[PDB]
């Protein structure tokens, strides 16, 4: 038929790290696959909006960082920002 793409192996790879003796079912996998798209769309839309606001046409790391800080409430923002900064620095080091 035709190819359809979805996150079905990365979630399992992540799960095989935190808990090495636990499986998952089909409906839970579908719920987890549908969960990611909402956050992705929200963050991308906020970033595009903020980039358009300042009379500029580019998307870079700072806009994504500001959108992440604005969206995620509570205490997760600090850890998420720290992890993102560390990953970006590690990739830049090459």
């Amino acid at each position: 038929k035709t190819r359809k793409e979805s996150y079905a192996i990365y979630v399992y790879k992540v799960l095989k790290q935190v808990h090495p003796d636990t499986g998952i079912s089909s409906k839970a996998m579908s719920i987890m696959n549908s969960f990611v798209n909402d956050v992705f769309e929200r963050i991308a839309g906020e970033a595009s909006r903020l980039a358009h606001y300042n009379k500029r046409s580019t998307i870079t790391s700072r806009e994504i960082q500001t959108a992440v800080r604005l969206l995620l409430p509570g205490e997760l923002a600090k850890h998420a920002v720290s992890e993102g900064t560390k990953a970006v620095t590690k990739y830049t080091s090459a």
Binding site: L50, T66, R69, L70
Partner: peptide, 10 residues
């Protein structure tokens, strides 16, 4: 808080 964040980003 949101107003200050918006001002800071620019």
């Amino acid at each position: 808080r949101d107003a200050v964040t918006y001002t800071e980003h620019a």
